[PDB]
Ligand binder design. Structure first.
Ligand SMILES: Cc1cc2nc3c(=O)[nH]c(=O)nc-3n(C[C@H](O)[C@H](O)[C@H](O)COP(=O)(O)OP(=O)(O)OC[C@H]3O[C@@H](n4cnc5c(N)ncnc54)[C@H](O)[C@@H]3O)c2cc1C
Ligand SMILES: Cc1cc2nc3c(=O)[nH]c(=O)nc-3n(C[C@H](O)[C@H](O)[C@H](O)COP(=O)(O)OP(=O)(O)OC[C@H]3O[C@@H](n4cnc5c(N)ncnc54)[C@H](O)[C@@H]3O)c2cc1C
Ligand SMILES: Cc1cc2nc3c(=O)[nH]c(=O)nc-3n(C[C@H](O)[C@H](O)[C@H](O)COP(=O)(O)OP(=O)(O)OC[C@H]3O[C@@H](n4cnc5c(N)ncnc54)[C@H](O)[C@@H]3O)c2cc1C
Ligand SMILES: Cc1cc2nc3c(=O)[nH]c(=O)nc-3n(C[C@H](O)[C@H](O)[C@H](O)COP(=O)(O)OP(=O)(O)OC[C@H]3O[C@@H](n4cnc5c(N)ncnc54)[C@H](O)[C@@H]3O)c2cc1C
Ligand SMILES: [Cl-]
Ligand SMILES: [Cl-]
Ligand SMILES: [Cl-]
Ligand SMILES: [Cl-]
Lengths: 388, 387, 388, 388
């Protein structure tokens, strides 16, 4: 029988989502110093088990449906992150790295790339950020110069997830149709493209495959452009609008792992003639952890449910990503504190979570970017109401 | 056409809730455009329009349904509070003050009291707290001594909403069957009971009808007891449980009023060659206000939806009341700041909200009590899982 | 014997400050055991007769305590007064703020005419800068002052004017038009009996103090009543506010100390659940945070006051003090309200009055947000100077 | 000349502290441009340069003075931490690890141990915590059984800084004179004691030498006891009371490093046609970082100055340690955020600080322990005032 106190009972969810949640949890329980090899193995395993189909749009191209089920992608990342940051990362990048193709690819492009993404035989990547511009996407400087039937790419992308091991990169570059955000085009760039160089492998506090890409006159056929020339900025933004809610879901999963560790330690740690959990400060701290988790989860699945009605979720996805990532930091930090010295011992669950969560407040748009999106949207909506 | 970005589109709501939300908003616009006199008027107007029926249980007794639709009660309080703290208070007390009769009354008691509560011709009140015992209800000292066919009541209740204007008070008193929480009984005490004295009117920062009640040997018939002797504590707690999420909903309504004031002021206040809303600090503050409101609203209506499925919501309602009241304080405080000096000018919308919100963090389970409820429940659930 | 754990033992203080602190506390106990106008008039007279208004006036020859203003002394006076009575603090504060522009920029005649009467409490001072459309943005004020022979003709409105309606004179800042914006403002001492000066309305705020909107209907002000040179009024206003900025922080601190005393006493005395409120961990942690905020605020206040008294500009330090003490006092007072339960919102209890009293101190004399920007800009300015 | 805006100008400091601050900064620039080997080298270098003398009490035993100059130890840790967590740790443990000997040793014990601590040829350690008892010191279970002229020690200590490389351990053990906190004695245990085993080397998120010690019937001569039997708990608490303020100082130094990184990045990072520092959110963030640093520093040096008057600082040291460690976490976290993706890049200054700070909220008494110390002290002082 359905536990009506579980979040899966919320009417944001359909029965298929409850079955999916049980299925991915069982996969995690049964299947979960070399992050490159681990990523490759996880992509293959998740692909063979069918879990990468949810991040791809189009049944003809290997997707679960013709739309991307945001609630499903979120439940997958939430459950994976609750067990393994590496497994979450692997599934996430098959979505984010292929999303621009689901959204904007031709028939040939969707046929060539999406089935292999969906079955885990091609590793995807999303190459937007640059050393000098991550938040300020509209001012990117990687250039794409038209030369006959190809574009010639020159410059650098960096912080690129799966960099060095991806089979292709969706690359955004300045083609120059108009200034700023109106001068960008999107390309699918196969990893074996001559002139695409892995300039540096990047180490971060919670290790994942990351690289700086240097484009040294790399030639990309015009037929590899996603969408129309100069329409690449909106494609990047629309791809991020899908998967920002999934970053919120991963944050939530990390927080749920910390919550489980924290309540177990509160119950088991004997001190002062009782247990840690018998103290009011512990009870109030656990309560706030749980409150943050429930508010995060409600925001995540409100946004995912809304996108699954066919609606734009620029505001609601930003809210979810902001709240869940900032909140998960607080939950994880509290769980570290409950563990005392063991909370900073290398390789304990909460020590790993303390490292894992920090980047989620930065990638797919930093917290401060999300806040300004929401604040600007509030004033835009008020101005529209005043007009009418 | 349903705006799919509106909270009313959430699947926590049924079609009847969307119709109700439009109806109570229309009533507010038509009717909210001497505190005791205002409350009396509001109760009668809400009653005549049908809005007090939602807080009464039992169609036979004037209620909207045989169960209380807590999503409906929440939407009513949220909408009323967004327009007027007094209007929210008037509806809220008709619910809280009669809830113990809906839960525990006999057929005669329900017939005698609930139809007049539901049509706004009897003002209800809930008399639990005492000068020395508010949070610690189990230690109350108001005594009820059995004497023939009546009980004799001696002692004080205080902080009693609608004190002095109520037509009856649901009074919880120690009958002494067992120590502490096991020795309390509940009574419906008519305002005209000899020995029931309105001892002092209480002034609070957001003025509402409030009084200290002194019981000077007030004789209450045994047939006015609600439930069995010694079962009054559970009745008080279950009555408060009905309306807990609706206190969160009122907080949310106050926050939404503050948000509307803040956004409008940010857009309209010219300064430094632009508007206040053009500054990043303003945009970030407005964004946090909106985030707090959406998280509060989701917590309120998750809890209300869950209770309406027939489930106990100890943890979820505590989360809603805690988050919405603490969050509304923050939203209101930010709106005061956006208004500058006008934010503390008496009678401006945001100055009134700054006063109105403060008590909601204190009554019906102070924030600190809500934290402990949630924390203890987390540990209880973990113990059950590991057993 | 000096209690070495008391803040007055800090080496930020000199012996004279310890003596003053005892004196003003004694005065409060003897004199501070409805009709706000009459109360303020009485408090100004009593503070004046006791010698306490001399510390906010510059120049021994003009009734001041010293030829410079002893900021540490003014802070201790406001801190102590506010700890007992918001009205008494207000009375002393406005004798300083309302006369500071004369201490700074008056001629010998102007200082002799006004400052001795401010210092002995026989003239109530006021500072008229803000306007309905220009509070934070002082440089855009629109009250006009037109030269006409031996006088200036003033037209327009000031508002939120403390002591408005009961002041004997107003230091008014008006646009004389020598140059745009902040460079076209002049300052005038305007006696309350000036024909054309009208009390347009009395203003009611949440913690009632005498306040008014002033309307100037062609008020002719003698040219000899100008403070400083034409067009130099803006810097005079800013320097006048600068004198007393730390003292607003000190008042905030005094309100917080009152709330702290109320909270600890209630925690100790309120019986509940077979013990006292103070026996609960949440109460102990809350009291501890109140005390931490108070000590941090006090250290920031008197660091800034000590530094100014060394002859140094304290742009960053005074902004930090006013920001931290006012925001922190709000938190301390809010926690004390919570400890009192229903009594915390009962009209006229100590903590209910403090909840109303503190709110405006975060808004006037540079709102919190303005203080944050002052500090942030100064950090960047100092960094630029270091790397130049 | 003395920059009067510098914290070193505060009257909490004497001229010798300003010269010491300059001297240790110069040492850092000249010397900090295998973790076990690194710590051994740092202890030797700091000892040879004279900097370990400040943590030792008694001129006859190699100390700088007959008292421990708290302000000096704090300035040393603050400056070292601002450059290197390893160097801070090395100096800190020469203090904490020998403090019980400075406080409670006989002439013979001080002569044997302190001169080599002070010149860096003996590495000290403080062995109090146990796997089952860290916060709840009074319930420790390591047993010391008297047997002739020696005590036989059995059990484990853990989280022991310098474990595995220390030359001696000050070990607190239950001798059983009375229950709980009244049954503990202190011993100096040479590292070569038979029956003392380094059972496990411990890895933490910011690596420092750490071990679990196992005592398997280790015979410790009675002459190695510090103080009287059963008086060991107070000796442990008094040792922590000295150095808790120095943990606050180290926290402050880490925060100052993060502040320097953050303001530099704000000034240099171009974005959106300007720099990161031109945005209000950045200015307010930097302002709050600076406010937290100044309030932390004021609390640190108020506590250090007060202890250096000969006064107990249980409340003031707890306040400093709590505020500075929690505040430094916030400052460092903000600096990570300002750096974007580079903020989590391994080995960058701010990424290292994010790992370094986390343990300081846990060791020498967790934040929650400090809050309860302060809260209980407020109620104790109120009860004493009521009684008087
Ligand atoms: C582990 C990891 C994985 C990543 N994966 C990918 C990937 O696969 N593909 C990819 O393209 N990128 C990826 N990124 C890069 C990431 O998207 C960027 O780091 C991020 O967008 C921030 O850009 P930045 O590092 O250049 O920081 P900056 O743009 O320099 O921003 C620095 C800080 O400034 C603040 N800020 C930003 N804008 C404003 C503003 N307008 N006003 C005020 N404050 C502001 C924010 O706090 C921000 O963190 C990844 C990063 C990490 C750490
Ligand atoms: C405007 C208003 C209307 C009200 N209306 C009614 C009404 O109609 N009927 C009625 O019966 N009552 C009513 N009340 C009273 C209200 O229920 C009580 O004020 C409330 O229960 C708190 O009791 P108290 O005031 O005695 O505070 P106390 O019991 O003294 O509690 C003081 C504070 O202690 C803290 N605290 C409490 N328990 C714990 C704990 N276990 N651990 C740690 N901290 C704790 C909380 O912060 C609390 O605010 C109203 C109150 C107000 C202000
Ligand atoms: C009780 C009281 C007494 C007063 N006494 C006096 C007196 O005696 N004399 C006198 O001349 N004035 C006095 N004032 C007026 C006071 O100085 C102004 O209220 C204050 O300067 C704010 O101006 P404002 O009200 O017009 O708000 P606004 O200028 O409209 O500002 C509204 C809000 O905008 C925000 N803000 C401001 N600037 C920025 C910015 N650059 N970036 C981002 N956010 C920003 C702040 O949060 C501010 O509160 C008093 C006010 C009060 C409430
Ligand atoms: C890097 C590092 C270096 C260290 N160096 C040394 C050293 O050299 N020597 C040494 O003896 N020890 C050392 N320690 C151990 C350290 O002092 C302990 O970890 C610390 O005292 C916490 O004890 P614990 O780990 O057993 O946590 P616990 O005692 O289990 O406490 C867990 C958490 O409970 C909370 N808590 C504690 N008491 C209460 C209470 N009464 N009420 C409510 N909440 C409470 C706190 O948040 C605490 O963090 C070090 C630890 C680290 C991480
Ligand atoms: Cl389905
Ligand atoms: Cl319906
Ligand atoms: Cl002196
Ligand atoms: Cl000296």
């Amino acid at each position: 029988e359905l536990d009506l106190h579980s979040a899966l009972a919320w009417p944001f969810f359909e029965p298929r989502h409850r079955e999916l949640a049980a299925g991915i949890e069982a996969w995690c329980r049964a299947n979960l110093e070399d992050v490159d090899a681990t990523c490759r193995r996880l992509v293959r395993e998740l692909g063979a088990a069918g879990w990468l189909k949810y991040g791809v749009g189009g049944v003809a191209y290997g997707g679960h449906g013709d739309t991307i089920d945001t609630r499903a992608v979120c439940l997958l990342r939430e459950t994976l992150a609750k067990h393994s940051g590496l497994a979450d990362f692997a599934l996430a990048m098959q979505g984010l790295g292929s999303g621009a193709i689901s959204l904007g690819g031709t028939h040939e492009q969707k046929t060539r790339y999406l089935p292999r993404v969906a079955n885990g035989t091609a590793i995807a990547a999303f190459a937007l950020s640059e050393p000098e511009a991550g938040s300020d996407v509209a001012a990117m400087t990687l250039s794409a110069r038209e030369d006959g039937d190809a574009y010639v790419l020159d410059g650098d992308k960096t912080w690129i997830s799966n960099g060095g091991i991806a089979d292709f990169y969706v690359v955004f570059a300045r083609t120059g149709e108009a200034p700023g955000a109106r001068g960008i085009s999107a390309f699918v760039v196969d990893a074996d493209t001559p002139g695409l160089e892995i300039a540096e492998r990047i180490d971060v506090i919670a290790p994942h495959p990351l690289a700086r890409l240097h484009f040294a006159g790399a030639r990309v056929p015009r037929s590899q452009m996603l969408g129309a020339p100069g329409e690449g900025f909106k494609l990047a933004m629309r791809t991020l609008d899908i998967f920002r809610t999934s970053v919120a879901a991963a944050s939530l999963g990390f927080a749920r792992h910390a919550m489980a560790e924290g309540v177990a330690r509160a119950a088991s740690r004997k001190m002062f003639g009782q247990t840690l959990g018998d103290f009011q400060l512990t009870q109030a701290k656990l309560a706030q952890m749980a409150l943050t988790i429930d508010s995060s989860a409600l925001l995540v699945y409100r946004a995912a449910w809304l996108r699954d009605q066919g609606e734009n979720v620029t505001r609601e996805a930003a809210m979810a990503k902001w709240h869940a990532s900032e909140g998960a930091q607080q939950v994880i930090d509290a769980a570290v504190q409950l563990y005392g010295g063991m909370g900073v011992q290398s390789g304990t669950a909460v020590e790993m979570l303390y490292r894992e969560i920090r980047a989620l407040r930065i990638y797919e748009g930093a917290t401060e970017v999300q806040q300004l999106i929401v604040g600007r949207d509030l004033l835009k909506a008020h101005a529209a109401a005043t007009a009418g």
